[PDB]
Design a binder for this molecule. Sequence first.
Ligand code: HEM
Ligand code: HEM
Ligand SMILES: Cc1cc(N)nc(-c2cc(Cl)cc(CN(C)C)c2)c1
Ligand SMILES: Cc1cc(N)nc(-c2cc(Cl)cc(CN(C)C)c2)c1
Ligand SMILES: C[C@H](O)[C@H](O)[C@H]1CNc2nc(N)[nH]c(=O)c2N1
Ligand SMILES: C[C@H](O)[C@H](O)[C@H]1CNc2nc(N)[nH]c(=O)c2N1
Ligand SMILES: [Cl-]
Ligand SMILES: [Cl-]
Ligand SMILES: [Gd+3]
Ligand SMILES: [Gd+3]
Ligand SMILES: [Zn+2]
Lengths: 401, 401
Amino acid sequence: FPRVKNWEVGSITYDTLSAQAQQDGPCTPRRCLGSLVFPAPEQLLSQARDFINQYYSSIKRSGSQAHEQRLQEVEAEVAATGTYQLRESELVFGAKQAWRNAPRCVGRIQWGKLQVFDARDCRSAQEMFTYICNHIKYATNRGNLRSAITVFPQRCPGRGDFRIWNSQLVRYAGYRQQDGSVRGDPANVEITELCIQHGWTPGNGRFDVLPLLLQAPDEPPELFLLPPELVLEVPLEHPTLEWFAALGLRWYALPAVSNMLLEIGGLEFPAAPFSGWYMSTEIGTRNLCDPHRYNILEDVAVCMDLDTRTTSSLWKDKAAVEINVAVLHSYQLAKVTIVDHHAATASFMKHLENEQKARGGCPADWAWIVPPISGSLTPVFHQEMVNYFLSPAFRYQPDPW
Amino acid sequence: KFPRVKNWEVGSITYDTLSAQAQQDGPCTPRRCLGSLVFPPEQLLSQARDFINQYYSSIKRSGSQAHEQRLQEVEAEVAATGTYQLRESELVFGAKQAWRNAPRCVGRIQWGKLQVFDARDCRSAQEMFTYICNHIKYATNRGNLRSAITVFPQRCPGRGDFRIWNSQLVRYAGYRQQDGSVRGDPANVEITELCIQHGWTPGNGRFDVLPLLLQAPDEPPELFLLPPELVLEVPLEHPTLEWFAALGLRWYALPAVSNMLLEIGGLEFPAAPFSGWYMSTEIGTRNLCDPHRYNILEDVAVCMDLDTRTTSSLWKDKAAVEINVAVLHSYQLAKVTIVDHHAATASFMKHLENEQKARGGCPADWAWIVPPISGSLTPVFHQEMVNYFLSPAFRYQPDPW
Ligand code: HEM
Ligand code: HEM
Ligand SMILES: Cc1cc(N)nc(-c2cc(Cl)cc(CN(C)C)c2)c1
Ligand SMILES: Cc1cc(N)nc(-c2cc(Cl)cc(CN(C)C)c2)c1
Ligand SMILES: C[C@H](O)[C@H](O)[C@H]1CNc2nc(N)[nH]c(=O)c2N1
Ligand SMILES: C[C@H](O)[C@H](O)[C@H]1CNc2nc(N)[nH]c(=O)c2N1
Ligand SMILES: [Cl-]
Ligand SMILES: [Cl-]
Ligand SMILES: [Gd+3]
Ligand SMILES: [Gd+3]
Ligand SMILES: [Zn+2]
C-alpha cells in the first residue's frame, strides 16, 4: 500500500485504490518511464463483469436481483452476439467514471457534473455533424461553459468505426510556409494538409478555424465547415499593456477533445468528444509560449522593454506571467468561463481529499497536474501522487490516417 | 527493451540503452508509478568487481596487467579482512561517477570537475571539524565557488560511524513560540532543538547560522561554532525595489550537503559532504517561498502593492519572479557563483547529449530536473527522461537517531 505524503502540511495517507489497477503501465522496478507522453469473449466478459459490479455499487444495489440479472444478461448477449449493449444510465455512469479516472486531468473536481449526450443511434457523417454542432452549442452556452460529452456508436464486429479526425473540435490551421516555417499553429500542420487534400479551400491567417473531418463506418472522411457563430472566440488584450491588442492574438472558448477513445466495461467508443473549460496556462503558457507552438515569448519581451540578452534578467518568466494575465483578463472581459492554475490546483487538492474518503486514493500524474509555470507556488507541487490506470477510461488511439 | 525517448520541442528520438544496468530496484511497478515520491557477508565482492571493471574501461585499461592484478588484491583484502580500501584514484573515480549518476541533480554538466579530499585517516569530531573547515573555505574561495567533496572513513561492523547530524553544513535556526509558530527556518526546527539540547545559545533571529553537531564512532555528538569569517552570506537586495533590502533577508553562499551516504564499489561512507553552487530558484523559490519554509511570498506582494484579493491577478507569480531577480542580483553583486534556471537547464540538455554519446543515456528524474518556476519555458520540460539507479551512487540514509 503506497504511502503518500503532503509536504506542505506533513500529512500522510495510503493509496489502497492503486492495488486494484487493472490494465498495466510503462514502469518497472528497473526504470521509471512516468515522463513519457504516450506510454477473446472471456476478457470482454470479465471487463464487463467488473464494470457492472462498479455500476451496481454506485446505486447501492450490490448483490441484488437486478445485479445478477444484468450479469446473466450481458453474458447471454456476448455468447449470442460477441458484444453487448450499455443501458443509458450505465452509459452516463461509465462516462463520469472515465473522467474521474483520468490521471492527467486537473479538472476532476467537477467529474460528477457532466452532461452526457447519447448519439449511439447515429447513422452517417451528416447526423454526426448535427450532434456535434448541438454539443458545441450546449457547451459554449454564450460563454458560461458546461461540461459535456457526446457518445457515438460503439466499435462492434462487422463495421468500421466512427472517427473524428481533428484532435479537437476547434483548432487553428497551421500552414507550412514559403521559407520552411509555419503560419498559424504548428501543432495542426498535418490535419491542415488533410483538410486541404479533402477539398478545403485554405485561408492564410494565423487563427483560421479548421473544418471538421468526420468518418462514418467504412466511409472516407467527409468535410464539414463549422458555422462561424457557433465558434465563440476571445480577442486577447492586456489590462495595462495596451500595445498587446496590436499583436492580434485570439483563442477560442471551448476545449473539446475529439480524438480519444472512451472504454466502458470492455466496449470501445472511438468517437466520443468531450469538452469543459480552459485553465489559463494551457492557453497562456503552452499554446502561445511553447517554442514549437505560437512562440510569442521573445516578441512580448522585446515589446515589454525587457533585456533579452541575458537569461539572468528572467525576461522569459516576466513576459510569460504577463501573457497569462492577458489570457485571464481577456476571458473575463468577454464573460467566458476560465480557471487559473491557483484556483484549479486548489480544487484539485479538494478532489484528492474527497477521493481518498470515497475510494481510498486517486490516480494522478504529478508531471501533468503541476502547472507549467509557478509549479511550487501551487499546493499540488508538494503532494506526492500515485499514477495508475483504472477502467472506465479515456485512452489515446492512433490517428485514422 | 531499450526505452524510446523523444524531445517534443525538436522531434528528436534517442534510445536509453544505459537503462539496461540498474541495480537497486526502483519503486515503480507495471501497476502503479511512484516516481513522484521524495524518499521512495560476501555480497561486497560483486559490487567490488564491477566498480573496478568500470574504472579500467574508463582509462582504456580493461583487460590489461594492472586490472587483473587489482582484481586479486581486493579478492585477498576481503578474503583476509572482510572489507577493502580503495586506491586514491578509485575513490576519486567513484565520487565523480556517483555525481554523474545522481538522477535529480541538474548540475551534472560539471561532473568531471570535482575536488576530492581524502579524510579517511580521521578520528574524533575535533578532527572532522578542521576537515570540514578546509572544505568550506576551499569550496567558498571568496565567492568563486568550486565543487568539492570530503570523504570520511568508510564503515565496518562492530564499530560506530562518522555522521554529520545537519543536512547541510550551513543551516539557519528554527525557533518555536508561545504558540508553536516558528521564527527562523521551519525546515531545521528539529536539529535546532538538538543543538539547544546539547547546550547551545539560541539566538533571537530569522537568520542565525546553526552550529554543526559532529559525531565520532560510538561517541555522542559535539557542538562546533563555525568561524563566522568562514560562513559567506549574501544580503538580499532588488535592483529597483529599494524597500526589498529593508526586508532584511539573507542566504548563505555554499550549498553543502552533509547527510547523504556515498556508496562506491560496495563500500559505504555515511559521512561524505559535497558542495557546488546554488541554482537561483533553490533559494528564491523553494527556500524563501515554500509555504512551510520562510513563506515570504505574501509579505513581498504587499510591498509591491499587488492585489492579493484574487488569485487571477497572478500576484504569487509576480512576487516570486522578483524574489528570484533579487537573488540573482544579490549574488552577482556579492560576486558569488550562482546559476539561473534557464542557464542551468540548457546546460543539462547539453549534458544529456554528451552522455548519450558517451554512455548511451543518462538517468534523470524529470520532476526534479524541471525547475519549480517557469518549467515549460526551459527545454528540459519538453524532454522525456528515463529514471533508474546506477552505481557508484549517493543514497539517502536514516537520520542518526
Ligand atoms: C471542466 C473543466 C476542465 C478542466 C479545467 C480540465 C483540465 C485539464 C488539463 C489542464 C489537462 C492537461 C491537458 C494538457 O495539458 O494538454 C487535462 C487532461 C485531460 N482531461 Fe480534463 N479538464 C476539464 C474537463 C474535462 C472533461 C469534461 C473531461 C472528460 C469528460 C476531461 C478529461 C480529460 C482527459 C481524458 C485528459 C487526458 C489526461 C489523461 O490522459 O489522463 N476533462 N484536463
Ligand atoms: C555545481 C553546481 C551544482 C548545481 C547547480 C546542483 C544542483 C542541484 C539541484 C537543484 C538539486 C535538487 C535537490 C533539491 O531540490 O533539493 C541537486 C541534487 C543533488 N545533487 Fe547537485 N548540483 C551541483 C553540484 C553537485 C555536486 C558537486 C554534487 C556531488 C558531487 C551533487 C550531487 C547531488 C546529489 C547527490 C543530489 C541529490 C539528488 C539525487 O540524486 O537524488 N551536485 N543538485
Ligand atoms: C476538456 C478539456 C479541458 C481542458 N482545460 N483541457 C483539455 C485538453 C485535454 C487534452 Cl487530452 C489535450 C489538450 C491539448 N493540450 C496540449 C493543451 C487539452 C481538455
Ligand atoms: C551540491 C548541491 C548544489 C545545489 N545547487 N543544490 C544541492 C542540494 C542537494 C540536495 Cl540533495 C538538497 C538540497 C536542499 N534543498 C532543500 C534545496 C540542495 C546540492
Ligand atoms: C516530456 C514531458 O513529460 C512532456 O512535455 C509533458 C510534461 N508535462 C505536461 N503536463 C501537461 N499538463 N501537459 C503537457 O503537455 C505536458 N507535457
Ligand atoms: C511530491 C513531489 O515529488 C515533491 O514535492 C518534489 C517535487 N519536485 C521537487 N524538485 C526539487 N528540485 N526539489 C524538491 O524538493 C522537489 N519536491
Ligand atoms: Cl488546447
Ligand atoms: Cl538549500
Ligand atoms: Gd499602460
Ligand atoms: Gd508605498
Ligand atoms: Zn514510474
